[PDB]
Subunit: 261 residues, 4 copies
Amino acid sequence: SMMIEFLNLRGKRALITAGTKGAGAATVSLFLELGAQVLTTARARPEGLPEELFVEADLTTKEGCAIVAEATRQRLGGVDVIVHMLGGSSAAGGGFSALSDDDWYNELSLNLFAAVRLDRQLVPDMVARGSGVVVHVTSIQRVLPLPESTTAYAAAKAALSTYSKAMSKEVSPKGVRVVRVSPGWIETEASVRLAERLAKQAGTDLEGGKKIIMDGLGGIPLGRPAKPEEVANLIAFLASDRAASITGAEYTIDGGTVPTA
Amino acid sequence: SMMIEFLNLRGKRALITAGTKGAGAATVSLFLELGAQVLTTARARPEGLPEELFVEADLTTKEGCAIVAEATRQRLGGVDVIVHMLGGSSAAGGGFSALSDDDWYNELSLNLFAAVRLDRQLVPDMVARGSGVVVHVTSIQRVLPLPESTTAYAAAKAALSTYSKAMSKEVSPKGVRVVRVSPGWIETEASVRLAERLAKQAGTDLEGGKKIIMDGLGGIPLGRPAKPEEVANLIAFLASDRAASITGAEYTIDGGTVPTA
Amino acid sequence: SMMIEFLNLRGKRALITAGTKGAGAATVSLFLELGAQVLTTARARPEGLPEELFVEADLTTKEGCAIVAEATRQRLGGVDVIVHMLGGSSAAGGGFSALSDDDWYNELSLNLFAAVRLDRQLVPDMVARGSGVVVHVTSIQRVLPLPESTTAYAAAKAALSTYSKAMSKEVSPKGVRVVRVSPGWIETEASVRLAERLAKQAGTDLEGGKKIIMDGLGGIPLGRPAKPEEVANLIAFLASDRAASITGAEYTIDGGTVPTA
Amino acid sequence: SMMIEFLNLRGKRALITAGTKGAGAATVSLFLELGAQVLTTARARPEGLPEELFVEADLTTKEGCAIVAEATRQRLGGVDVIVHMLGGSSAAGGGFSALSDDDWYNELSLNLFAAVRLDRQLVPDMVARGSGVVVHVTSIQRVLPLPESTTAYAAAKAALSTYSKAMSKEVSPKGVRVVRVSPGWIETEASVRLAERLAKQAGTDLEGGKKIIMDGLGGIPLGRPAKPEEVANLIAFLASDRAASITGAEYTIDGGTVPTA
Ligand SMILES: [Ca+2]
Ligand SMILES: [Ca+2]
Ligand SMILES: [Ca+2]
Ligand SMILES: [Ca+2]
Ligand SMILES: [Ca+2]
Ligand SMILES: [Ca+2]
Ligand SMILES: [Ca+2]
Ligand SMILES: [Ca+2]
Ligand SMILES: [Ca+2]
Ligand SMILES: [Ca+2]
Ligand SMILES: [Ca+2]
Ligand SMILES: [Cl-]
Ligand SMILES: [Cl-]
Ligand SMILES: [Cl-]
Ligand SMILES: [Cl-]
Ligand SMILES: [Cl-]
Ligand SMILES: [Cl-]
Ligand SMILES: [Cl-]
Ligand SMILES: [Cl-]
Ligand SMILES: [Cl-]
Ligand SMILES: [Cl-]
Ligand SMILES: [Cl-]
Ligand SMILES: [Cl-]
Ligand SMILES: [Cl-]
Ligand SMILES: [Cl-]
Ligand SMILES: [Cl-]
Ligand SMILES: [Cl-]
Ligand SMILES: [Cl-]
Ligand SMILES: [Cl-]
Ligand SMILES: [Cl-]
Ligand SMILES: [Cl-]
Ligand SMILES: [Cl-]
Ligand SMILES: [Cl-]
Ligand SMILES: [Cl-]
Ligand SMILES: [Cl-]
Ligand SMILES: [Cl-]
Ligand SMILES: [Cl-]
Ligand SMILES: [Cl-]
Ligand SMILES: [Cl-]
Ligand SMILES: [Cl-]
Ligand SMILES: [Cl-]
Ligand SMILES: [Cl-]
Ligand SMILES: [Cl-]
Ligand SMILES: [Cl-]
Ligand SMILES: [Cl-]
Ligand SMILES: [Cl-]
Ligand SMILES: [Cl-]
Ligand SMILES: [Cl-]
Ligand SMILES: [Cl-]
Ligand SMILES: [Cl-]
Ligand SMILES: [Cl-]
């Protein structure tokens, strides 16, 4: 039989933030394979990643966001898809009372403010054209918070999620879709390190460390974290014309972790 | 150079219920196009299409379920994907007090219990094998009920949605994914007839009738209903191996209608 | 100082279903103490209660609900507050596949149908008057289903919860408030016996079985189940004029069990 | 015969922030009436009101927090109930792209960070004692965002709501309850001013302005905003010993506005 491509991103210009590790890297790679023109960002460029595809910036600062917006306008001449994948938590444990003003600022800057600053610069152009998609990568912690080290992370992600829905109400009628992808635990080099650290301090092994993390989430019905490529798959679907009626929604990819209907 | 092969359903055996029209027909068509082996059901048979593709049965009875389950075993030899698409509302207006026992029975039998009977027959075999996907097509009314004629419809869809999440908790650890697709207004011949009826009654044109439907939902930010093909696209994605980490979740396709984050 | 009663139910005529054990009994007791005129129901004649305060009926049947409706009108002369407290699960374990048609019918009749039948009979007259409150006692399982024996219980409670919100949309503009109270584990003779059966099967003590229950829920942050009187307190508040702006909402009383924001 | 003593706050020491007007003033008054020892805050004390009742401070600063925390320790000797009522939006219209850095800072500082700062100082001592209640007053916009001027307000309220749930997970096991009260539109002098502004720009009257607000929310089934005293009633119930099993939950008071189950 002959093929008709079902899902691609041909002709689309995509800005993917934080695309050098984990799900970000998998999303950059998949978008390129699906025919998108891609610009991605990070504080350091991997040697194997062609310079034309990359702009170096610290997205936790206003200056870094300005640099990325500039490169988007200059290299892409317009953007059709923005995938916000910058996020993370650097706060130590100790619960709410151990969150300093610096912790709160860091969590908000990384998980909310970069997306807000970039959208404020880039989305009005997309609206002017009358087409495009914005994907905010949130986190199941926006609904299912873990307090030990991620109280401010969860709060920042919840702000992001509601902000995204608010954006969707405004710009969906003008032809720009705005969706959220909410991952649970993603298998990354960094989370292997986490599992090893927990395993050592608990006196168990890697699988024991894995179990500690999963138990800490209330269990993952699927029994494993999501793979970077799995997150990429969902983002590519939502960015594609096969998802033209999907806007103002959050699509969870977590192996069933969130235990509510 | 080569064409993109992102998503297909080659090798999958799929039972899709209620595939004669609307999103059901679009999903049958797309699954066949993506390489699946498909069986579908009809209470009354459409004239043109082959006998092998449809089994005639009333899924709202024990007899009908048995017929469909036997046909699945005989024609497909097993099933990798069950897509439940039987549903609808025939209750008249007048609000909750105008729902007779007949109305309640009709709504629960069509929107919940057909799926329940079929899953009880077929899902245990999928669990024994250790692989597969069940898709329950719910409705945004399960969260956003419209009371005039659809109070019992909304309630039945809510039961279905929570039942689906319960199943996911049980069977996801055993290798079977269970997901929900929750549509808003889908543009079908039936809903176009509804629009026409509302238009002639309000003394407006077809576009005015569609606006009456949209306003009744509280507005659709996207500005249009979903097409049958669009619902099919989402179901195919979720049924595919590109969705291996997605279980125990409901994915809404409603153009932004549900106004909560 | 002198007292002005903050919360009472003086002058209110209340039907409280299933008011002879557990939270139902505590709610009957409290409503009487707050000055309500009360009618309650049970299948069995409770030794402690004056004849006038109760009517014997099987609310899982149509004729039973008619008996209760008829008695409500005959004895109270109308009703200002309906508290639906009939509910429970008699299904055995084994997950979804072990739910027979009898199990499904029993779960729906007990947890959804009785409320539907009684509301259809009694709420229109409250609407005609332009005042009143309906309280549907749901369950955290409507959002947090436990699949082993309570898949159909959870589904029924989810139907009830969405039905309640639909009816609130219809009747709140007409002066009747409709609210839900959603309990977690309530410490009752029934739930102590469940702890026993679990204790027996696990070969531990009784509180050992209580630990099994709490662990099975994903933990209770408060560290204990709700007391019947605590459920009564919340229902009394919501039935009172101190809750006049509260309608179409579900108030959860579960010690923090549901882990989502 | 005797009068009903259902609920009071005798013996409790309560800090209620922002008690000058609106729901804050109503909550201060009700708490005093129920027998609580109360301290409240304002940027400037209203003349004629006792000096002891108010502490003058800007809770959006580290200094202001320190001042309020020290006044709490000096005047109350500790605190049993903290009711966070500081909040509001002063952003102008124009949607997301009209939200300057000033707007985002204002919204987060007033609606999230004042409460976070104060909790960080006061909650650990409540935890050490092993009893108490924290109430975070959120907003239905945390789930139902309105984009014209309140995109950042909604986002900040969503952060607050998830933060509150995170804190509840941490401190509920230690004997401190943490709950949210989420109001819809509250009738205040400020919202009368808003209705008058909207009325003017639309060339209608006050009732027309009210209709514009209610339509902007998607309609209020009850048909009116909540009164300050109504919000106070709910906060008082939750702070009382009648709510001992309620923690980690959000109780919405909005006349049915949020249209989802
Ligand atoms: Ca820290
Ligand atoms: Ca990771
Ligand atoms: Ca889980
Ligand atoms: Ca989930
Ligand atoms: Ca009817
Ligand atoms: Ca009928
Ligand atoms: Ca059974
Ligand atoms: Ca049978
Ligand atoms: Ca009323
Ligand atoms: Ca838990
Ligand atoms: Ca502004
Ligand atoms: Cl990685
Ligand atoms: Cl970003
Ligand atoms: Cl944690
Ligand atoms: Cl992760
Ligand atoms: Cl990594
Ligand atoms: Cl190891
Ligand atoms: Cl699940
Ligand atoms: Cl493809
Ligand atoms: Cl059709
Ligand atoms: Cl046939
Ligand atoms: Cl059957
Ligand atoms: Cl079906
Ligand atoms: Cl309706
Ligand atoms: Cl037309
Ligand atoms: Cl939207
Ligand atoms: Cl809205
Ligand atoms: Cl939300
Ligand atoms: Cl009992
Ligand atoms: Cl009688
Ligand atoms: Cl009546
Ligand atoms: Cl009942
Ligand atoms: Cl009946
Ligand atoms: Cl839910
Ligand atoms: Cl219980
Ligand atoms: Cl009992
Ligand atoms: Cl909690
Ligand atoms: Cl948790
Ligand atoms: Cl009282
Ligand atoms: Cl009290
Ligand atoms: Cl005021
Ligand atoms: Cl500080
Ligand atoms: Cl505050
Ligand atoms: Cl700015
Ligand atoms: Cl501190
Ligand atoms: Cl306490
Ligand atoms: Cl929400
Ligand atoms: Cl707005
Ligand atoms: Cl005011
Ligand atoms: Cl309204
Ligand atoms: Cl409502």
